Scaffold this active site. Structure first.
Site, PDB file in Angstrom:
ATOM      1  N   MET A 189      -1.836  -9.722  12.661  1.00  0.00           N
ATOM      2  CA  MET A 189      -1.764  -8.241  12.810  1.00  0.00           C
ATOM      3  C   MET A 189      -2.874  -7.741  13.741  1.00  0.00           C
ATOM      4  SD  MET A 189      -0.913  -6.837   9.012  1.00  0.00           S
ATOM      5  CE  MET A 189      -2.515  -7.226   8.310  1.00  0.00           C
ATOM      6  N   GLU A 222      -7.390  -8.891  15.175  1.00  0.00           N
ATOM      7  CA  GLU A 222      -8.565  -9.802  15.177  1.00  0.00           C
ATOM      8  C   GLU A 222      -9.796  -9.046  15.689  1.00  0.00           C
ATOM      9  OE1 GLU A 222      -7.329 -11.722  19.545  1.00  0.00           O
ATOM     10  OE2 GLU A 222      -7.869 -13.059  17.884  1.00  0.00           O
ATOM     11  N   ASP A 272     -21.002  -0.196  12.276  1.00  0.00           N
ATOM     12  CA  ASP A 272     -19.864  -0.621  13.138  1.00  0.00           C
ATOM     13  C   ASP A 272     -18.702   0.374  13.015  1.00  0.00           C
ATOM     14  OD1 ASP A 272     -18.840  -2.284  15.111  1.00  0.00           O
ATOM     15  OD2 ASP A 272     -18.023  -3.756  13.683  1.00  0.00           O
ATOM     16  N   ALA A 294     -11.084   0.880  15.781  1.00  0.00           N
ATOM     17  CA  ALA A 294     -10.566  -0.422  15.293  1.00  0.00           C
ATOM     18  C   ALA A 294     -10.896  -0.622  13.807  1.00  0.00           C
ATOM     19  CB  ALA A 294     -11.118  -1.551  16.127  1.00  0.00           C
ATOM     20  N   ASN A 295     -11.996  -0.032  13.320  1.00  0.00           N
ATOM     21  CA  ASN A 295     -12.464  -0.160  11.913  1.00  0.00           C
ATOM     22  C   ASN A 295     -12.066   1.085  11.109  1.00  0.00           C
ATOM     23  OD1 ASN A 295     -13.494  -2.710  12.317  1.00  0.00           O
ATOM     24  ND2 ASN A 295     -15.629  -2.061  12.476  1.00  0.00           N
ATOM     25  N   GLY A 348     -14.577  -9.883  16.238  1.00  0.00           N
ATOM     26  CA  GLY A 348     -15.695 -10.831  16.403  1.00  0.00           C
ATOM     27  C   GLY A 348     -15.824 -11.783  15.226  1.00  0.00           C
TER      28      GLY A 348
END
Ligand SMILES: CCOc1cc2nn(CC(=O)N3CCN(C)CC3)cc2cc1NC(=O)c1cccc(C(F)(F)F)n1
Length: 280
Positions: free
Chosen positions: A25, A27, A140, A144-145, A29
Site C-alpha cells: 500500500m 513505504e 515527523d 504521508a504521516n 525510510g
C-alpha cells in the site's frame, strides 16, 4: 492490543507481496506497509527495514506511546511481532491512505474538496494538540504521516521518533524546521512541519518536487510573503468549492507556523482556534 506471530502476518499479507493494487500500500525510510486480514478486520502491517539497533528503539518507542493510546485523530496500534526475523507493527486499516496520496489523486481517486481539506486540517491539528498536551513531540509531521479512515478523518501516524539538542538529526528535510535540522528537539518544530502540510493542502503540491521550480514548497511561501506572488496563483486547480477568503485564513495560519524564529510561531492550541475561526 496483543502479540502476533510473524508467520500469521506473513500469511495474511501473501508472504509480504511487494506488488501493489498485490498487498503493498505504501513505504518509507523505516519500512513497507502491507494490507492484511487478521481476527475479523482488515489491518495495516508495517514490516520495519533500514541501524538495526535504532530500528528496534523506534519499534519499542512506537509500542510504549501507542500500546494504550486511543484518540479520534491518532492511528490505533492493534499489536506487533518480534518473534520472526523482521519487526512488524499492526494498525487498524485506513481505507483512504495518506493525505499525500489523496492530494496526488494516486490510483485515480477524485480530488479532495476544499470542505474535505478543512476538516482534515482541523483533525490533524487536534491530533498534534493531544500529543503536545501529553508532552509528546512527533518529530515527523507530514502529509504521508496523516492517514484518512472510512470518513476521511485525519489520523496522525509514525511515533518511532516521538519524544534539548540531539546528536542524530532525524526527520523529513522537506518539512523540518531550521532548528530541527540543527538537532533541536521542541514541539515548536511540529508546528512548522504542520505549516508545510497546510501549504500541501492549499496547493495540492508535494513539499519537495525535484522536477519543480521552486523545488521546495517552503520557497513558494517565501515568494508570496515578498510580494512576488499571491496564494491565489498556487491554489489547487483540482477544486471547485475553494473561496479566496477561507484559503487566505488557512495560508495566514500556515505563514505564522512557518516563522523561522521558533518562539514567534503559534502553539498548537492557537493553531486549532485559528482553524476553527476559519470554518465557524
Ligand atoms: C502509511 C500509508 O499506507 C497506507 C496506504 C493506503 N492506501 N490505501 C488505499 C488504496 O490503496 N487505494 C486503493 C484504490 N482505492 C480507490 C483507494 C486507494 C489505504 C491505505 C492504508 C495505509 N496505511 C494504513 O492503513 C496505516 C494505518 C495505521 C498506521 C500505518 C503505518 F504506516 F504507520 F504503519 N498505516
Amino acid at each position: 492490543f496483543h502479540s502476533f506471530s510473524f508467520y500469521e502476518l506473513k500469511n495474511v499479507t501473501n508472504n509480504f507481496d511487494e506488488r501493489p493494487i498485490g498487498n503493498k500500500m505504501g513505504e518509507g525510510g523505516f519500512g513497507v506497509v502491507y494490507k492484511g486480514y487478521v481476527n475479523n478486520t482488515t489491518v495495516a502491517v508495517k514490516k520495519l527495514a533500514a541501524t538495526t539497533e535504532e530500528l528496534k528503539q523506534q519499534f519499542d518507542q512506537e509500542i510504549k506511546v501507542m500500546a494504550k493510546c486511543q484518540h479520534e485523530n491518532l492511528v490505533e496500534l492493534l499489536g506487533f511481532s518480534s518473534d520472526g526475523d523482521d519487526l512488524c507493527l499492526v494498525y487498524v486499516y485506513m481505507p483512504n491512505g495518506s493525505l499525500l496520496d489523496r492530494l496526488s489523486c494516486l490510483d485515480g481517486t477524485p480530488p479532495l474538496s476544499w470542505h474535505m481539506r478543512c476538516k482534515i486540517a482541523q483533525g490533524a491539528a487536534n491530533g498534534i494538540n493531544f500529543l503536545h498536551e501529553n508532552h509528546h513531540i512527533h518529530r515527523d509531521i507530514k502529509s504521508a504521516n496523516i492517514l484518512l479512515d472510512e470518513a476521511f478523518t485525519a489520523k496522525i501516524s509514525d511515533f518511532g521518533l516521538a519524544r534539548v539538542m540531539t546528536s542524530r538529526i532525524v526527520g523529513t528535510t522537506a518539512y523540518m524546521a531550521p532548528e530541527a535540522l540543527r538537532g533541536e528537539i521542541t514541539p515548536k518544530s511540529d508546528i512548522y512541519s504542520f505549516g508545510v502540510v497546510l501549504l500541501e493542502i492549499i496547493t495540492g503540491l508535494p513539499a519537495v518536487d525535484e522536477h519543480r521550480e521552486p523545488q521546495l514548497l517552503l520557497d513558494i511561501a517565501a515568494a508570496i510573503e515578498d510580494e512576488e506572488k499571491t496564494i491565489e496563483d498556487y491554489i489547487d486547480k483540482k477544486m471547485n468549492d475553494a473561496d479566496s477568503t477561507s484559503v487566505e485564513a488557512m495560508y495566514s495560519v500556515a505563514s505564522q507556523c512557518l516563522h523561522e524564529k521558533k518562539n514567534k510561531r503559534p502553539d498548537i492550541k492557537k493553531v486549532q482556534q485559528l482553524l476553527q475561526e476559519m470554518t465557524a
